[PDB]
Amino acid sequence: AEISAVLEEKILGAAPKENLEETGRVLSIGDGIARVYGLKNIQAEEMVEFSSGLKGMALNLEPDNVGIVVFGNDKHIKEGDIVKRTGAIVDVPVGEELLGRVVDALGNPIDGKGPIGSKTRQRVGVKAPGIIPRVSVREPMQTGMKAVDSLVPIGRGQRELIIGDRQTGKTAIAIDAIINQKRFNDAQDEKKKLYCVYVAIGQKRSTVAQIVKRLTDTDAMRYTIVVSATASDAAPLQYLAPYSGCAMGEFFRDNGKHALIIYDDLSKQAVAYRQMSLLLRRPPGREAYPGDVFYLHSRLLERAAKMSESNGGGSLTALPVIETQAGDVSAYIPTNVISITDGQIFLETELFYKGIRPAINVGLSVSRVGSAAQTRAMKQVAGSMKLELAQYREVAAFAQFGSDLDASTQQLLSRGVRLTELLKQGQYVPMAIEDQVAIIYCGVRGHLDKVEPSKITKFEKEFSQHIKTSHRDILDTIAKEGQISPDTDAKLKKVVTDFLSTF
Amino acid sequence: GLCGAVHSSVGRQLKADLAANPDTMVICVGDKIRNILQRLYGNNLAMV
Amino acid sequence: SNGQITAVIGAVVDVQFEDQLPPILNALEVQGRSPRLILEVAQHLGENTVRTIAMDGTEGLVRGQNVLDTGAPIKIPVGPETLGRIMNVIGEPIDERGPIVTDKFAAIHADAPEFVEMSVQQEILVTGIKVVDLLAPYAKGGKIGLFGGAGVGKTVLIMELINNVAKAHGGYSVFAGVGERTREGNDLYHEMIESGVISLKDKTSKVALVYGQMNEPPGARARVALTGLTVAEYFRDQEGQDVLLFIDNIFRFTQAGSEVSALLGRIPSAVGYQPTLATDMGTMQERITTTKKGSITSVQAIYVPADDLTDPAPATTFAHLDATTVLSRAIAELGIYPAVDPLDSTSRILDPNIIGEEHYNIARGVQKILQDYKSLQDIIAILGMDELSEEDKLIVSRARKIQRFLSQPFQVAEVFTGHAGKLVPIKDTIKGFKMILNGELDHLPEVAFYMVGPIEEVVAKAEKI
Amino acid sequence: SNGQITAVIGAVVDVQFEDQLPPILNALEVQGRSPRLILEVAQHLGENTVRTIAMDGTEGLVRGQNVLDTGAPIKIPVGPETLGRIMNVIGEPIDERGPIVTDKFAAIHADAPEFVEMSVQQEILVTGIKVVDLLAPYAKGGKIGLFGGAGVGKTVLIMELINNVAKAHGGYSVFAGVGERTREGNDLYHEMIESGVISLKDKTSKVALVYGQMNEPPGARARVALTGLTVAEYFRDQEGQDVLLFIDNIFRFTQAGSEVSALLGRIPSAVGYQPTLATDMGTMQERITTTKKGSITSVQAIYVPADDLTDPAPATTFAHLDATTVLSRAIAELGIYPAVDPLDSTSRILDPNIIGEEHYNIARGVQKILQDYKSLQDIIAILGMDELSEEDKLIVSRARKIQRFLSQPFQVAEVFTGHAGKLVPIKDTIKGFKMILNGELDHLPEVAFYMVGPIEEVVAKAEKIAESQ
Amino acid sequence: QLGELGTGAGKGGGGGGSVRAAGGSFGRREAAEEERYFRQKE
Amino acid sequence: QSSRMTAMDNASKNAGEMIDKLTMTFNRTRQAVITRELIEIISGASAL
């Protein structure tokens, strides 16, 4: 602390007034970093307020100055401006008043729909739940996609990474998961309701506006909170936005309800955090990232948990998004998030342009919850599907130069081709779990071997309609039983053969 | 096999014979011709 | 107040003030310079010293030279008086046609429009380029990026877009030459005065030119894109117009920022770039958008260094664009022009509910054949064409016919190619690729599909052989 | 003495003392703090200032806050009272079962046992895993490393080793959860309770758990491995027991040291790491050893970043282990579980004079067939299977039978797959692979060798396939 | 999408020789001819 | 035999060309890795 005014008043023995323990003055300001002299009673990661009305967070506490990141444009901050302590660390509004609202990283509404009447505020940096308060992940979290709910299942309380290149369908997976919860939120079952939270980090405001337009048209906005820290916002806002959205989802998790968080995308939050660390003169590491960039994502995603029945039983499900560069998952940030999350959904550009949409690489996509994240009917049909897809994987290569094949092998090749075309699905149309089970069950029991793969989608709509208004007793029978009995299997096969004769 | 386009083009010429003389039995010397042509005209193969 | 120069290192000048510091982004004017030298305040260093970035050359500057504070950021002329004129980064006219007499001025630093002022409507902008109109169609009002290396063709592609879209356009256009050839600026300027888009006689001009080229210092090259934005922002907001903004090229804005950042005392980021690469780009790119007041259709050429799409500057630009057009050197070396990569260009309007079911299915069908061709090309390279007899050879034959048919002669490339330029309606484009996908043209040679616009010229070329 | 906080930058806190300075590795406690934040002295900066790393979150720290020197390093409770309990990095009970009432405390920093105290006993530890028992057999009292990337099966393998060894071991066991998922720690805690290894009622608990997970700061994740090691060292030394030390994941000890090393004023090393990587790993690993007083059988899961075994953290760990089992993604993608690479996993007791001549010759014979299989695959790609001669036909056929037979269903993975778990004796493993090498089962299909424990189940599965088809 | 055999070691499907580790289409050819032979045997 | 001889001749020439291009790509990537790793170490050393 040796500046010319402070040095000179130390020579005179003036003992100056305006004591700098709850206040301070800016020494240097630039690139969103303000070095402030004073603020002696300040706390680490504490909010401050500048004389221009802007807010800031004190990250570096040093004997001479305080390193403060600026929540906005630093053109308003000037050298010698008065910085005041807020007195508390960063907190955001929480509650159900934020459902249907678009907010920034600090909780201020940006959709122009008026003030938010929230009653409670939680600090964004709470500690994750421990070993005791959480229970094993057991409830299915329905994405609505056949390739996800069967092969890479997601349970309530699980971090599942959606990783891929640019324009591979990562946002498509996340938005369709939010849209799929319309069925459960309309129903009377309070246990199966899911309140989604979408966090947009570093995107365009027109991209976020297109997201809100899609969610409002599908009426998914009533249970969705959109936290938006776009590219025009400051790097501290984009860094703070996943923790703000996590705190909003932690309100539902701690109150017995089930919430879903999408961080779209965490690769941009690392870029924002790298910019703050470099401009705070902290020494960089791999790809100029700070050392604590792993702890950045680990302390965020660990707060996604399935609480025990003594803590209300609520869950917090996280779907982080990571963008790779030409499929390089050996980079610093994709490697960290893969090692943190409970599973991955790899999306490949080669599969995307081969017609496979969603472009999920089944050989690279894992899920550490396994069959416990699936319902009983889905577990019965996805296990048989995983065996048949494994058998198809052994025999799918024969189309390269093979010409004569065994009759059983040809049946395996034909059924697996039907299954690969079964896993394809259009965008913005998530299907219910009963429809996914029924279509997959027909695919793995040979009910589609006589159908050309080009008409699989037409069969998927029309046959499901036929067993909906006419054979709804069978659907009630499966729902009450919870699985597929041999008698129900024979009944469904007879309806399939009757429908194929009429087809 | 894997000698080039030998068995593929010869079988292709044989396929043109199947579109010209569908009722002609064919005696093949080699399994590759049998592999290609059994799917199309397995009812018109004398011996391989 | 009045300051004095403390340090001059390249484009970065440190100025110390006595009474009151100018704010960040304020414009400072150096006194003893015969042309105007403008310094833009970047940061406060302490001890009443600010660190500035010069918009021109810093040679001849001495320490202690008086610097005047204008009290405002860089304000440039805006309005109808800028149409048909060429201005530099600081708004001075460089067309030697006198001053830009106007009452309207605007700072080149402005906040991006808020989330409320966003338009969600998407309509297809028909270009006349078959590869663009089919696989990655442009939105009428939206951000379009032209990724490519050096020589793959981005100036030619953006000049063809000016020739097709901007000539028949009910509105105004803005061209921002950012770190490109001054020869190209002279060629485009005389192209406008010859095509009538710029009128030197009366006030019927429709395009405003802003040029900071590759001979300019890094301060001018990192701010002249903001000057082109400010002219286009005035037309969108204060007049409600539909504006075209062509930027050639936006990588030079980021590259010039890295050159200044070396002298700003920052810890370098990945691949030697500035730490604020994404934030500076995001602040600039979010101002280029269509709001409820007016629409801006922006086409931005984007240079990739060393033909690397994983470089931080092109990679962060990908998320700012509705439609991307990635130009490949391998395609250009095959003689296919425009060298658009079919499996790397996206549109964000390639949707059955936006462009139609038949347009979407043909585009997805084309990409499926070309992706199957890329998978088979390793067998073709080492072993040869002997693979799967009828099936894979039909895939190769159709894909090579599609690759030839994606090529198209440009009207702006007619001087150095000889082939007449073709403007192809999008109905003829989807009809032409549907004929190739259906197998109706398997008997034609693949030379007949090359460098001809309509599919009727393909069969006419085949009959000529 | 008493000190005051000078700087707080990340997980690194600089504190200044007026009296005598605390030594390096001493434990400091922040006074005006509710969850008992503890700082560990890392270096003396001069001018009566020491630089520390925080064992908990640093939010809310104020410059000038009083810090108290405990006069000793971090001391944790040790003894039988830690059995069936969960401890954090600083020894506080995090299982919500009240305080750990005990009389014995041990510092988590200690010197490694000397060269005179080293034991050269090497006897084979039978685990029931066929690829482990045959190709890279574990030794009792030796160090075992489970190398692998993310998702290859290190956690499932270390859960299977706990099920097969620690349930009927005899003597205490210690699990150290270092920088992993809290869900996995909750899953293991309840699996131990259901298995009876943890008793919530009686004193018959066998395993002591120490957990510092991904949500912990880098200071806690870089010291929690020393906390679990201190519990294992007390059981080895002060009780003479045979101790099982399961660590997952030991890479997080290295990674958490690299996160704070930049803020400690260190130039980065190659790739990007602390310059003290080999020394910090060496001091930690050489405490985990079999003394002449007692034996510690250590099984450590080792994360391989981006599946690059030449990364400095897995590469330095190789020299510290008697047996290393490398889990490969290529093996896992084929469906083979466990995904142990047969041509990348080594053991020190893989000797004719330790495991017998028949065990050694079959293991070397298996590795020779699998190596020739990799060499022949390039000829298969170009020449095709048609032109290979009957010798290479039998090499490829027996290699695929061997490669399928290395897979095995796990009891802890039964909920994942549905296959019942199987435990295979070492004698049945040697006999089963000898039959495949001799060619006694050349008429069997290769699908009969997939996910079956003994070779008698291979014959039964082949008969079932033949009878059904 | 299933990680076809021979597409690459760690790339979804593969594991074995240099061609199978490299993946692409020759690893697919190696897996195709090998699995065709052993399916004919069974 | 003539077709198999000229097919292997074409395959060996094409593999030889692919070896040369992959060798230059390997040399560029090896040099880029060394340069990038050293710049990261220098940046960490200079930031102290």
Ligand SMILES: Nc1ncnc2c1ncn2[C@@H]1O[C@H](COP(=O)(O)OP(=O)(O)OP(=O)(O)O)[C@@H](O)[C@H]1O
């Ligand atoms: N299952 C699908 N079927 C059809 N089109 C799809 C599907 N999934 C995604 N798409 C389309 O592919 C394009 C890219 O997908 P999306 O934008 O979701 O990917 P992304 O990885 O989020 O891209 P970005 O890198 O721009 O964020 C969009 O035009 C989207 O409509």
Ligand SMILES: Nc1ncnc2c1ncn2[C@@H]1O[C@H](COP(=O)(O)OP(=O)(O)OP(=O)(O)O)[C@@H](O)[C@H]1O
């Ligand atoms: N559509 C086209 N038709 C024919 N030739 C073309 C076309 N586009 C580009 N070329 C060729 O490529 C050259 C490069 O043109 P252009 O200036 O557009 O490239 P660029 O990407 O802007 O490169 P630079 O980095 O030099 O600005 C042209 O002079 C011409 O030879």
Ligand SMILES: Nc1ncnc2c1ncn2[C@@H]1O[C@H](COP(=O)(O)OP(=O)(O)O)[C@@H](O)[C@H]1O
């Ligand atoms: N022995 C096994 N049998 C079957 N699947 C396994 C086995 N081991 C691992 N897996 C697969 O790996 C996933 C869990 O991997 P895990 O052990 O958590 O990896 P890591 O040790 O790297 O965390 C499971 O979803 C499962 O599908």
Ligand SMILES: [Mg+2]
């Ligand atoms: Mg997206």
Ligand SMILES: [Mg+2]
């Ligand atoms: Mg150009």
Ligand SMILES: [Mg+2]
């Ligand atoms: Mg693990």
